[PDB]
Amino acid sequence: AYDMDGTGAGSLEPRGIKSSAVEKDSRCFKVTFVLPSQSRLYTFRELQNVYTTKMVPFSSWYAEQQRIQKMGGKILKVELVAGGQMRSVGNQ
Amino acid sequence: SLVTQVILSADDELRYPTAGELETISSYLKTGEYRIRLISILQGKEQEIIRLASKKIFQLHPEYIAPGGNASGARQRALCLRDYGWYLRLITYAILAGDKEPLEKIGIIGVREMYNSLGVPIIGMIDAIKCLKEATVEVISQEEEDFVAPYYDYIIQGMS
Amino acid sequence: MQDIITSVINQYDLSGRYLDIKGINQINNYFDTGLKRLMIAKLINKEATNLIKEASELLFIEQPELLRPCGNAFIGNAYTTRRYAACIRDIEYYLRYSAYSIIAGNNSILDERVLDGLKETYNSLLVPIGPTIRVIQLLKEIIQKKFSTENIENAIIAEPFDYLAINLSDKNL
Amino acid sequence: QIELDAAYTSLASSRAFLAPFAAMAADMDIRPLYGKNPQVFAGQFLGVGAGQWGKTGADTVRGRSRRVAADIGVKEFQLERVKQLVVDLQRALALEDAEADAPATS
Amino acid sequence: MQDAITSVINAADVQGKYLDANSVEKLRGYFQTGELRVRAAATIAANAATIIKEAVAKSLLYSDITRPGGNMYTTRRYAACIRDLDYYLRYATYGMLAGDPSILDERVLNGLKETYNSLGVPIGATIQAIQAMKEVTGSLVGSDAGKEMGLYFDYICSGLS
Amino acid sequence: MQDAITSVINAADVQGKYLDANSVEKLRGYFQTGELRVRAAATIAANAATIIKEAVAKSLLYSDITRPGGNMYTTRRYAACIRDLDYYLRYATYGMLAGDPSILDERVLNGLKETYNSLGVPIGATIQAIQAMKEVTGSLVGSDAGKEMGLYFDYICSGLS
Amino acid sequence: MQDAITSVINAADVQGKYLDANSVEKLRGYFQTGELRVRAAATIAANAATIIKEAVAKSLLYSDITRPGGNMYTTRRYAACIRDLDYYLRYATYGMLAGDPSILDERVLNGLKETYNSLGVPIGATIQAIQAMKEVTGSLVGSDAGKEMGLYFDYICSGLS
Amino acid sequence: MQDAITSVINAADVQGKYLDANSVEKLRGYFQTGELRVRAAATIAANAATIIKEAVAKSLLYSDITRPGGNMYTTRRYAACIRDLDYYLRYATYGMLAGDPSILDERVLNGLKETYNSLGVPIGATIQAIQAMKEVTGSLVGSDAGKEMGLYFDYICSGLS
Amino acid sequence: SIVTKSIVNADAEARYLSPGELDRIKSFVLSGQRRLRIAQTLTENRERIVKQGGQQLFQRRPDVVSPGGNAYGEEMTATCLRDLDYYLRLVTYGIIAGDVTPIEEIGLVGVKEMYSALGTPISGVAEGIRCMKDVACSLLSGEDAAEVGFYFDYTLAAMQ
Amino acid sequence: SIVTKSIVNADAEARYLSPGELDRIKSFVLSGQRRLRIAQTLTENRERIVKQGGQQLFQRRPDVVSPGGNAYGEEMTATCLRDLDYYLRLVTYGIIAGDVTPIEEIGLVGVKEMYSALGTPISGVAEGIRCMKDVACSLLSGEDAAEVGFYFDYTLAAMQ
Amino acid sequence: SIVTKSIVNADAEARYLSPGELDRIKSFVLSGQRRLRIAQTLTENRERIVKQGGQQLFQRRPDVVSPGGNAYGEEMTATCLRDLDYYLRLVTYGIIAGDVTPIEEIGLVGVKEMYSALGTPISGVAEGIRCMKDVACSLLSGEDAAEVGFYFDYTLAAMQ
Ligand SMILES: CCC1=C(C)/C(=C/C2=NC(=C\c3[nH]c(/C=C4\NC(=O)[C@H](C)[C@H]4CC)c(C)c3CCC(=O)O)/C(CCC(=O)O)=C2C)NC1=O
Ligand SMILES: CCC1=C(C)/C(=C/C2=NC(=C\c3[nH]c(/C=C4\NC(=O)[C@H](C)[C@H]4CC)c(C)c3CCC(=O)O)/C(CCC(=O)O)=C2C)NC1=O
Ligand SMILES: CCC1=C(C)/C(=C/C2=NC(=C\c3[nH]c(/C=C4\NC(=O)[C@H](C)[C@H]4CC)c(C)c3CCC(=O)O)/C(CCC(=O)O)=C2C)NC1=O
Ligand SMILES: CCC1=C(C)/C(=C/C2=NC(=C\c3[nH]c(/C=C4\NC(=O)[C@H](C)[C@H]4CC)c(C)c3CCC(=O)O)/C(CCC(=O)O)=C2C)NC1=O
Ligand SMILES: CCC1=C(C)/C(=C/C2=NC(=C\c3[nH]c(/C=C4\NC(=O)[C@H](C)[C@H]4CC)c(C)c3CCC(=O)O)/C(CCC(=O)O)=C2C)NC1=O
Ligand SMILES: CCC1=C(C)/C(=C/C2=NC(=C\c3[nH]c(/C=C4\NC(=O)[C@H](C)[C@H]4CC)c(C)c3CCC(=O)O)/C(CCC(=O)O)=C2C)NC1=O
Ligand SMILES: CCC1=C(C)/C(=C/C2=NC(=C\c3[nH]c(/C=C4\NC(=O)[C@H](C)[C@H]4CC)c(C)c3CCC(=O)O)/C(CCC(=O)O)=C2C)NC1=O
Ligand SMILES: CCC1=C(C)/C(=C/C2=NC(=C\c3[nH]c(/C=C4\NC(=O)[C@H](C)[C@H]4CC)c(C)c3CCC(=O)O)/C(CCC(=O)O)=C2C)NC1=O
Ligand SMILES: CCC1=C(C)/C(=C\C2=NC(=C\c3[nH]c(/C=C4\NC(=O)[C@H](C)[C@H]4CC)c(C)c3CCC(=O)O)/C(CCC(=O)O)=C2C)NC1=O
């Protein structure tokens, strides 16, 4: 149910990003970034806005913030808008 | 370079390079000094290959330069000899970084659409590079003629 | 897919045995022609745009019915340039995927990415399989012209283009 | 000095953290499987095996109080290095002041 | 991303010149030290779980952050914290292989510090663990490989400060 | 979110202590008044439609706001009006049950003052509409039940001004 | 998204009144010029690929941008340049048909000055590319219709700098 | 999915009737055994790894399917084998709580026989592993709850042959 | 927590708590006095539960205390017992909160990644919790030992 | 049912039910005797609850049965009271199921689309259910009339 | 296989084989007769490697052959060395193929689930493979022992 059940190297599930969020976590950030396509010049799809500011859950910020980096994007700011800091229980 | 392809190919799987991937870096890095002499010979003949290749494209495509074409003129023909300081320059960048990325990040990507803005026959430059490969073979021996040969074909296949 | 080494290594793993001389003789036969299988692929890379024009021209000179109207049964041929463009695209798929299998020494890449689902797609668009088997065999006859002196390069070249015709063909006999 | 004294208060706080369990496991019966009598096969642990004794012997012992003790020994090394640097600085000041009280330019 | 080779290609391309003598000289240093880096990257990949385990113990298991009331107290925060160190050790090996620290600015230090500040992760204690990881790895690969690995462990810290 | 039970577990866990006498007293304060919140929580869920209909007509119905050119003029703007008031009433009922207004800061007051200022929503009128919604909701659950109820309506209005 | 007729309706609607005398002349003004706009957008769409060809050659062709070190140097950067001008010309055509420049705010300038600033694209050169493209269009579509297309070109330049 | 309660409601509603005496007795049969099912469900969840570990050793641990040529030979196929056994144990526990095998039809058995025929998994050896897993479970939960769990172990085997 | 966990399931659908969910919260606060009493019984029998439960663990798993095991040494054995007091404390949080959210968020999420980084066998931590569960079930009543065992069982399933 | 929502909710996470989730099932089967008795008391008062409910509805809404209203005529008023019997039957299912999910899956999903197509005012069906709630709540005790009224208020909220 | 790796990488980009992949395949075909020698030396010395390899494993981990250990007994110790023979076989497959793909697909994917469901300490299998690698590297020359060390190293990293 949560991403930290022990799945690592030499397991049956393929290696991916693992989050430290609890089951049904409810912490969300507020991020800002630019992400060019870097593939439109051989697909010829439509043009889209690449300047984004959105709320992203804690459960996906590791994967999203790690995907923006792989695809050449640049993160301009990130803040926590929902949730407590160093809370032991009460993140659900 | 070849190390940036292995490091990037492994990073999206979230792992270290494998035993066969680390061998790709080892063999390439050991052949780095032979690639460092080959591209120096090319830089010494950059002014002469144009002299042989410029002869070829115009006897093969004489309709481009004659009156009746739109882009010819005594005005622009002055700085002609500085041209292949750009294209075979990329061929020296690709001979050093032993792969096609410098020839593909620059050059091939967007080269067709780049010329279609004008309406120029794109088949001319495809033949311009093919005759360029004909030019680079006489100023170079036969042993390292097989070493720079596969790098030209990628430009023809990329433009086509 | 599986190269020639992986097929021999998987056939021995199925018995739970190590590689003896019989399995090492097979791997040596690929390590002998391996340096020659690259000269063939580098030739295709240099002549790729030429080998497709001549295969297309020789195909339409013998099958003039493909460049003409489709008939009320809406057969998909090279009637219009929208169809002519799409059908020349297919001739590259046969040439590209046949160059891969010449370096793999095995037809596993051919069926796993070309043949599984091909007749279902051509029967869906009504594309003729007869002419398609011919142009695959015209590419074989052309590429063998560059390699005439030594005949061990003809066997390597015919393997990918023969497999596609034997597996796309209908079993009449 | 006054961050070495903060290291000693962390060693005293690390022992009080584990002292309900350090004395609670002191009257348990902890019998091992090998290592003590020679009639049982112990393998590597007849003694210790092949380089694994360490540079000191205390570096192979794990624990919260052994780990803050290695912090103390690296913090007392930097205090003793600079306390021996004020000794020979104080020598050169006196050896230049012996020139001053001798009849000279100052 | 750019390695030692692409750095001279990216440089000569913007001015538009061919590679000169001085540019060729530093590439010789990278090519000569090639098998030194490939051997180091192989041993770090096998002893990855061992380098992080005694770097955390030498740095974090003694302080008060593993006790209640500190970061990485709970198991959820102890697993998340040794997960980061597995990334720092993997990206530092990419830098030693590529011979250039540019990959750390793009895929490590890209929005990472601002994430720690909101969450409340101590930036000083993170530097202490990456620094302890630097000597622990310097004993496995030797002094030569250990010095190159220290250029990218020190790089992650100088940008995280 | 953290309720009254979780908030005392948090205070104890940050010290490593079990639940002492001062902690068990706060827990009985929640359990003793617990079945009163469950009864008040069902009474407001049944009268939610009328608590909003009487608060709106009494506060901002024939006001200039509903005339042409004001806010809540179009039917969508009117429907977004009464859709917001039910959001506050539904979340103030979540807080009275949990006995801790932590759910209001994460899912209601999460930057709601900037959103209302950008759109041009009159903050002075929304605070008086929530207040008007407190006088009709208080006459339903009584005074003892309204004490914990009105404790969160003022939390939204105070965190909104 | 809103064109001229929906903006003249919004003026009378925001005061709740009916369309009086002055409102129709602003409607007849758009109706009388309706044929002049649709005939201009037909000629622009047929000469799109060529209208850009001189605009690049008019201002940005022999500059330092196409040369190494400047922007538009690499083929990928040149293709992105002319691809951006095509979207400027199309959206500038939509705005002239609607007679209201609102469409340029929602679907063009939303995040454009920030995108260009992050990549390093020159705002001064792009302003010359659109000012160059604005003059050539005035020749094809004519003098009167050419100024209307120009009114939406300067709108993009004014809000882009 | 529907449990024993909803299965009685649907049988009545499909006729338009209220719950009569014949359906009320079925509702009493479930309430009387509700505490016994919740007790068995908690012990199965805690001993799941040992029920699968002992059903595998007894049935197929040293058989022909261990060794090369047989199925479940490689570690990726051994690990997929015991992931199927963890489906049947968990879904047989849902059916025991609900008292209705409806959830075994939708989320387990629907199209499961064709999946095994395409993959090449032996059905006879799978049924023997569930039967060995039924005997180990029946000894942990007792004789009364043990024959309830076996009621939904046989639904999987008969729904699989 | 029962209250927190039922407000999240109603905040997702964006609706008030239904009469079925308010009836479960009511039957939870009615059992508040009895839960505070059971947590008190474990809180005052800490030494006996940790001392008796840990002694049984070192008899069933002598390898953890033999040379080469994780809990070899007087500080390593005392820390092995420090963990059992952690899991006993979290069990009292779970009994009072009405659910396992205090146990799961603190010491169950990432427990396998933690103990694998310390070198501890997770099957030995699960055997130590099973030795504390019967020592704790002998100090409670018939119906309280049954309810307390539910929270010890859940810590066993999540630790396998 | 309470059991159904606990099993599907724990299937989306692919895990077993927790002790907090199993207590809600134990607490629910304990109240099975009271639920079967309250549903029986309503089933025995069908003609009074329905007829009494539809009698008060035609005084608070006299237009629905007058000339021009939806329920004008004996045949139409008969089907008028037929609908109230559907929701009384659904309310007895929810009281026995332990939650309002039978009322929702039967006669609340798409209720506004159904009644808008038939030409029936949905506001009148909610007024007729509120009148049946007062009649049904006058036949019960102190705490048994409180929970049964919650099942009548849920239907009205979802019907507006 | 490194050949298969280079054909599927060019397939993803929808282009022919590039010069960076055609010289890498040349390095592999040119190094073929040397791999078949090394892989056949480990195949002819299986007993001395597996028997010596397990010998040194039973001295670094005596708890696996003690009473209660996993490999305790004559039949369980024989199954212990059955697994060291599987992983020596897969290592020879990986040396002939030029990459670690045959090791990954056979005995590395899901290896933790297998040994965790058997009761075997995964750290003891990695400690035995590390002891076979020492005997394996004693039969080879200085440079061939480094070539084979990469394939033994990949198995350990995946088994940790
Ligand atoms: C890599 C293996 C592979 C192959 C071969 C392949 C073929 C393929 N051929 C297609 C169409 C087509 N193919 C042809 C081909 C021909 N017409 C003739 O008369 C000749 C017999 C033949 C040329 C030699 C035509 C005309 C269409 C378009 C049919 C239509 O749209 O009417 C299409 C549908 C268009 C699309 O791609 O979206 C596919 C998928 N796809 C694959 O993945
Ligand atoms: C409905 C729009 C449409 C057109 C026109 C079209 C033409 C078309 N012309 C073709 C070839 C050809 N077309 C021409 C000649 C000419 N073509 C001209 O429009 C000129 C009048 C003349 C040159 C002065 C020649 C000589 C060939 C054969 C080239 C070859 O051998 O490949 C082919 C290739 C197959 C063939 O016919 O041999 C197509 C598909 N397709 C279309 O979908
Ligand atoms: C509240 C949830 C929670 C847990 C559980 C937790 C565990 C935890 N266990 C630790 C160590 C340890 N834990 C053990 C445990 C064991 N050895 C054995 O043989 C047994 C199998 C097992 C206990 C049953 C040992 C030996 C150490 C010391 C390891 C070292 O220092 O290298 C440490 C590092 C030092 C310390 O502070 O104790 C943490 C943080 N932290 C938490 O926040
Ligand atoms: C590859 C580049 C990269 C990194 C490194 C990265 C880190 C990162 N660390 C995180 C949290 C965290 N990181 C830590 C780390 C630590 N605690 C300590 O005491 C130590 C100082 C430190 C370990 C060295 C902790 C405890 C959290 C959880 C914070 C919380 O839950 O409150 C999070 C939030 C999401 C999540 O935890 O799943 C991200 C995105 N992201 C990236 O893209
Ligand atoms: C769950 C917590 C939460 C809140 C509170 C929330 C508010 C919120 N109110 C909005 C609009 C609005 N809000 C109002 C509100 C008012 N008009 C008045 O006269 C009063 C002063 C006031 C209250 C009745 C109006 C009229 C709009 C429509 C604005 C528009 O359509 O442009 C919008 C824009 C989206 C939309 O058009 O529906 C949001 C996101 N969103 C949330 O997620
Ligand atoms: C509809 C409104 C709209 C616009 C205009 C838009 C533009 C836009 N321009 C881009 C890049 C770019 N744009 C340029 C543009 C220029 N270089 C020059 O020298 C010129 C002065 C200038 C053009 C006149 C370049 C060079 C890049 C690529 C930068 C790089 O690759 O480093 C990108 C990144 C995606 C990609 O390059 O594939 C977007 C999304 N997006 C939108 O939604
Ligand atoms: C080709 C990839 C592959 C592997 C590796 C594999 C392993 C495997 N190991 C097994 C057992 C076993 N494996 C061991 C292994 C060990 N005991 C120790 O103490 C050591 C740490 C360790 C060996 C170094 C033992 C003792 C058993 C028997 C366990 C039992 O019977 O309960 C079994 C069950 C019996 C059988 O069917 O053979 C399999 C399938 N199968 C495969 O297909
Ligand atoms: C179990 C959930 C459920 C409901 C509620 C339901 C309603 C339903 N109401 C109907 C008609 C009707 N419903 C009414 C209702 C009313 N007239 C009034 O004045 C009142 C305001 C209102 C409520 C008493 C009337 C008058 C008709 C007949 C309409 C006509 O004949 O024109 C019909 C068409 C005839 C029939 O099949 O009976 C259906 C199916 N079906 C369902 O499955
Ligand atoms: C990789 C290096 C690189 C180049 C060159 C480039 C862009 C570039 N150089 C061009 C033309 C050019 N056209 C000529 C001359 C001619 N053209 C020919 O093919 C004949 C030799 C002759 C026929 C008249 C020359 C020398 C250039 C390069 C710069 C210039 O002189 O304008 C054009 C066509 C439109 C124009 O700018 O006028 C582009 C787009 N981008 C790049 O990244």
Side-chain angles (χ1 to χ4, degrees), chain I residues 146-160:
Chain I
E147 205 272 359
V148 174
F150 270 66
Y151 293 82
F152 274 113
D153 278 352
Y154 183 82
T155 314
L156 279 173
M159 206 170 290
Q160 293 177 328

PDB file of all heavy atoms in Angstrom, chain I residues 146-160:
ATOM      1  N   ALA I 146      -7.511 -10.721  24.244  1.00  0.00           N
ATOM      2  CA  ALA I 146      -7.896 -10.978  22.863  1.00  0.00           C
ATOM      3  C   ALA I 146      -7.812  -9.710  22.026  1.00  0.00           C
ATOM      4  O   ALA I 146      -7.419  -9.758  20.856  1.00  0.00           O
ATOM      5  CB  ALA I 146      -9.306 -11.561  22.810  1.00  0.00           C
ATOM      6  N   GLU I 147      -8.178  -8.568  22.607  1.00  0.00           N
ATOM      7  CA  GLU I 147      -8.122  -7.310  21.872  1.00  0.00           C
ATOM      8  C   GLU I 147      -6.683  -6.833  21.716  1.00  0.00           C
ATOM      9  O   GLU I 147      -6.307  -6.295  20.670  1.00  0.00           O
ATOM     10  CB  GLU I 147      -8.977  -6.259  22.580  1.00  0.00           C
ATOM     11  CG  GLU I 147      -9.496  -5.151  21.678  1.00  0.00           C
ATOM     12  CD  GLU I 147      -8.541  -3.984  21.563  1.00  0.00           C
ATOM     13  OE1 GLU I 147      -7.473  -4.019  22.208  1.00  0.00           O
ATOM     14  OE2 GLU I 147      -8.863  -3.027  20.828  1.00  0.00           O
ATOM     15  N   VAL I 148      -5.863  -7.019  22.752  1.00  0.00           N
ATOM     16  CA  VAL I 148      -4.465  -6.609  22.681  1.00  0.00           C
ATOM     17  C   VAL I 148      -3.699  -7.447  21.669  1.00  0.00           C
ATOM     18  O   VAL I 148      -2.752  -6.960  21.042  1.00  0.00           O
ATOM     19  CB  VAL I 148      -3.817  -6.687  24.073  1.00  0.00           C
ATOM     20  CG1 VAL I 148      -2.333  -6.401  23.985  1.00  0.00           C
ATOM     21  CG2 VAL I 148      -4.487  -5.714  25.014  1.00  0.00           C
ATOM     22  N   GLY I 149      -4.077  -8.715  21.500  1.00  0.00           N
ATOM     23  CA  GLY I 149      -3.376  -9.565  20.553  1.00  0.00           C
ATOM     24  C   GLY I 149      -3.563  -9.137  19.114  1.00  0.00           C
ATOM     25  O   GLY I 149      -2.727  -9.441  18.261  1.00  0.00           O
ATOM     26  N   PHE I 150      -4.657  -8.432  18.823  1.00  0.00           N
ATOM     27  CA  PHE I 150      -4.899  -7.958  17.464  1.00  0.00           C
ATOM     28  C   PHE I 150      -3.825  -6.971  17.029  1.00  0.00           C
ATOM     29  O   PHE I 150      -3.410  -6.958  15.866  1.00  0.00           O
ATOM     30  CB  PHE I 150      -6.283  -7.319  17.375  1.00  0.00           C
ATOM     31  CG  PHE I 150      -7.372  -8.281  17.003  1.00  0.00           C
ATOM     32  CD1 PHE I 150      -7.727  -9.308  17.858  1.00  0.00           C
ATOM     33  CD2 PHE I 150      -8.044  -8.155  15.802  1.00  0.00           C
ATOM     34  CE1 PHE I 150      -8.729 -10.194  17.520  1.00  0.00           C
ATOM     35  CE2 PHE I 150      -9.047  -9.038  15.459  1.00  0.00           C
ATOM     36  CZ  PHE I 150      -9.389 -10.060  16.320  1.00  0.00           C
ATOM     37  N   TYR I 151      -3.364  -6.128  17.955  1.00  0.00           N
ATOM     38  CA  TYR I 151      -2.352  -5.137  17.611  1.00  0.00           C
ATOM     39  C   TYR I 151      -0.959  -5.745  17.587  1.00  0.00           C
ATOM     40  O   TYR I 151      -0.079  -5.246  16.879  1.00  0.00           O
ATOM     41  CB  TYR I 151      -2.415  -3.965  18.586  1.00  0.00           C
ATOM     42  CG  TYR I 151      -3.685  -3.163  18.458  1.00  0.00           C
ATOM     43  CD1 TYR I 151      -4.851  -3.572  19.084  1.00  0.00           C
ATOM     44  CD2 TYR I 151      -3.724  -2.007  17.698  1.00  0.00           C
ATOM     45  CE1 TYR I 151      -6.015  -2.852  18.962  1.00  0.00           C
ATOM     46  CE2 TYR I 151      -4.885  -1.279  17.572  1.00  0.00           C
ATOM     47  CZ  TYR I 151      -6.027  -1.708  18.205  1.00  0.00           C
ATOM     48  OH  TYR I 151      -7.187  -0.985  18.086  1.00  0.00           O
ATOM     49  N   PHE I 152      -0.734  -6.811  18.355  1.00  0.00           N
ATOM     50  CA  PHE I 152       0.527  -7.532  18.254  1.00  0.00           C
ATOM     51  C   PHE I 152       0.581  -8.369  16.984  1.00  0.00           C
ATOM     52  O   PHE I 152       1.653  -8.524  16.391  1.00  0.00           O
ATOM     53  CB  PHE I 152       0.727  -8.420  19.479  1.00  0.00           C
ATOM     54  CG  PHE I 152       1.372  -7.722  20.639  1.00  0.00           C
ATOM     55  CD1 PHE I 152       0.663  -7.491  21.803  1.00  0.00           C
ATOM     56  CD2 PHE I 152       2.686  -7.304  20.569  1.00  0.00           C
ATOM     57  CE1 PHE I 152       1.251  -6.853  22.873  1.00  0.00           C
ATOM     58  CE2 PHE I 152       3.281  -6.666  21.637  1.00  0.00           C
ATOM     59  CZ  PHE I 152       2.562  -6.440  22.790  1.00  0.00           C
ATOM     60  N   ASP I 153      -0.557  -8.916  16.557  1.00  0.00           N
ATOM     61  CA  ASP I 153      -0.608  -9.668  15.310  1.00  0.00           C
ATOM     62  C   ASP I 153      -0.336  -8.786  14.099  1.00  0.00           C
ATOM     63  O   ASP I 153       0.381  -9.204  13.184  1.00  0.00           O
ATOM     64  CB  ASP I 153      -1.971 -10.343  15.153  1.00  0.00           C
ATOM     65  CG  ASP I 153      -2.068 -11.646  15.916  1.00  0.00           C
ATOM     66  OD1 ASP I 153      -1.039 -12.105  16.452  1.00  0.00           O
ATOM     67  OD2 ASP I 153      -3.177 -12.217  15.976  1.00  0.00           O
ATOM     68  N   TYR I 154      -0.901  -7.579  14.071  1.00  0.00           N
ATOM     69  CA  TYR I 154      -0.704  -6.695  12.928  1.00  0.00           C
ATOM     70  C   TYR I 154       0.754  -6.276  12.796  1.00  0.00           C
ATOM     71  O   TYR I 154       1.250  -6.070  11.685  1.00  0.00           O
ATOM     72  CB  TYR I 154      -1.605  -5.470  13.053  1.00  0.00           C
ATOM     73  CG  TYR I 154      -1.525  -4.526  11.880  1.00  0.00           C
ATOM     74  CD1 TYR I 154      -2.247  -4.766  10.722  1.00  0.00           C
ATOM     75  CD2 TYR I 154      -0.732  -3.391  11.932  1.00  0.00           C
ATOM     76  CE1 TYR I 154      -2.179  -3.904   9.650  1.00  0.00           C
ATOM     77  CE2 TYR I 154      -0.658  -2.525  10.866  1.00  0.00           C
ATOM     78  CZ  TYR I 154      -1.382  -2.785   9.728  1.00  0.00           C
ATOM     79  OH  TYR I 154      -1.309  -1.920   8.663  1.00  0.00           O
ATOM     80  N   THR I 155       1.457  -6.142  13.921  1.00  0.00           N
ATOM     81  CA  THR I 155       2.882  -5.844  13.857  1.00  0.00           C
ATOM     82  C   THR I 155       3.682  -7.044  13.372  1.00  0.00           C
ATOM     83  O   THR I 155       4.825  -6.890  12.931  1.00  0.00           O
ATOM     84  CB  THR I 155       3.390  -5.390  15.225  1.00  0.00           C
ATOM     85  OG1 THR I 155       2.486  -4.425  15.773  1.00  0.00           O
ATOM     86  CG2 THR I 155       4.762  -4.763  15.101  1.00  0.00           C
ATOM     87  N   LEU I 156       3.103  -8.243  13.446  1.00  0.00           N
ATOM     88  CA  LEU I 156       3.795  -9.433  12.965  1.00  0.00           C
ATOM     89  C   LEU I 156       3.621  -9.596  11.462  1.00  0.00           C
ATOM     90  O   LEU I 156       4.549 -10.012  10.760  1.00  0.00           O
ATOM     91  CB  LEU I 156       3.281 -10.669  13.702  1.00  0.00           C
ATOM     92  CG  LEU I 156       3.878 -10.914  15.085  1.00  0.00           C
ATOM     93  CD1 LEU I 156       3.173 -12.065  15.770  1.00  0.00           C
ATOM     94  CD2 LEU I 156       5.362 -11.189  14.969  1.00  0.00           C
ATOM     95  N   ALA I 157       2.432  -9.278  10.950  1.00  0.00           N
ATOM     96  CA  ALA I 157       2.195  -9.388   9.516  1.00  0.00           C
ATOM     97  C   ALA I 157       3.008  -8.359   8.744  1.00  0.00           C
ATOM     98  O   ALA I 157       3.580  -8.671   7.692  1.00  0.00           O
ATOM     99  CB  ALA I 157       0.706  -9.229   9.219  1.00  0.00           C
ATOM    100  N   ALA I 158       3.074  -7.125   9.247  1.00  0.00           N
ATOM    101  CA  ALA I 158       3.797  -6.069   8.552  1.00  0.00           C
ATOM    102  C   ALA I 158       5.306  -6.205   8.688  1.00  0.00           C
ATOM    103  O   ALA I 158       6.043  -5.435   8.067  1.00  0.00           O
ATOM    104  CB  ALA I 158       3.359  -4.700   9.068  1.00  0.00           C
ATOM    105  N   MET I 159       5.782  -7.157   9.488  1.00  0.00           N
ATOM    106  CA  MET I 159       7.206  -7.361   9.694  1.00  0.00           C
ATOM    107  C   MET I 159       7.708  -8.647   9.054  1.00  0.00           C
ATOM    108  O   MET I 159       8.800  -9.115   9.395  1.00  0.00           O
ATOM    109  CB  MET I 159       7.522  -7.352  11.189  1.00  0.00           C
ATOM    110  CG  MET I 159       8.937  -6.933  11.520  1.00  0.00           C
ATOM    111  SD  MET I 159       9.164  -6.677  13.285  1.00  0.00           S
ATOM    112  CE  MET I 159       8.216  -5.184  13.526  1.00  0.00           C
ATOM    113  N   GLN I 160       6.939  -9.226   8.141  1.00  0.00           N
ATOM    114  CA  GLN I 160       7.354 -10.434   7.442  1.00  0.00           C
ATOM    115  C   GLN I 160       7.616 -10.143   5.970  1.00  0.00           C
ATOM    116  O   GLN I 160       7.131 -10.856   5.091  1.00  0.00           O
ATOM    117  CB  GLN I 160       6.296 -11.526   7.577  1.00  0.00           C
ATOM    118  CG  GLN I 160       6.127 -12.053   8.984  1.00  0.00           C
ATOM    119  CD  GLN I 160       5.021 -13.079   9.084  1.00  0.00           C
ATOM    120  OE1 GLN I 160       4.025 -13.006   8.362  1.00  0.00           O
ATOM    121  NE2 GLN I 160       5.193 -14.049   9.973  1.00  0.00           N
TER     122      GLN I 160
END
